[PDB]
Amino acid sequence: MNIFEMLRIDEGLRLKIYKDTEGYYTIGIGHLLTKSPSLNAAKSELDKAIGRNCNGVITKDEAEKLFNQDVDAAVRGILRNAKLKPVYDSLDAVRRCAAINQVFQMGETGVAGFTNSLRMLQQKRWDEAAVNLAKSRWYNQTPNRAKRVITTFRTGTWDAYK
Numbered sequence: 227m228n229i230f231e232m233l234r235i236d237e238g239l240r241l242k243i244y245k246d247t248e249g250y251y252t253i254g255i256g257h258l259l260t261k262s263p264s265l266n267a268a269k270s271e272l273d274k275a276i277g278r279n280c281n282g283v284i285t286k287d288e289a290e291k292l293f294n295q296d297v298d299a300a301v302r303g304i305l306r307n308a309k310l311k312p313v314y315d316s317l318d319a320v321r322r323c324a325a326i327n328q329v330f331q332m333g334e335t336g337v338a339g340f341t342n343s344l345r346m347l348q349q350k351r352w353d354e355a356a357v358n359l360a361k362s363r364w365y366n367q368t369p370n371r372a373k374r375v376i377t378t379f380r381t382g383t384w385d386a387y388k
């Protein structure tokens with residue numbers, strides 16, 4: 227198991243513009259296109275991102291390409307954050323995959339409000355962090371996925387992904 231397989235499991239793969247759990251235009255492997263409600267805005271964004279007139283549809287390779295760049299950006303976004311980096315570097319390899327997944331899902335922004343949980347994770351108080359992490363809009367909005375990530379951080383193993 228690795229980050230790609232793990233997020234591929236959590237985000238699915240769609241080759242046509244779709245709305246995500248929050249109602250926003252997205253495509254491929256969880257790639258957010260825009261928060262605007264204008265489908266035309268979304269198609270534009272898509273064309274800009276792919277480099278061609280897509281008409282709301284992309285290829286698997288196109289989707290995989292967007293994904294790579296997105297994982298990359300996420301990690302990099304972590305390492306660039308001063309509040310984040312130190313937490314991330316204190317963790318082992320599995321748990322680091324769980325940090326990337328949350329950031330990929332919510333942005334470095336969404337994640338900045340987890341301060342308390344971040345501290346517990348840095349302190350390696352797993353069970354405590356897991357409880358703190360559940361007390362959030364994120365777990366209440368996408369519980370099944372939040373569960374798998376939380377278990378991941380709690381255990382340091384890939385069991386929730388089987």
Ligand SMILES: Oc1cccc(Cl)c1
Nearest residue numbers: 310313314325328337
């Ligand atoms: O979202 C998270 C959670 C833990 C560590 C980092 Cl770096 C990010």
Ligand SMILES: [Cl-]
Nearest residue numbers: 274275276295
């Ligand atoms: Cl792009």
Ligand SMILES: [Cl-]
Nearest residue numbers: 368369370371
């Ligand atoms: Cl879910």
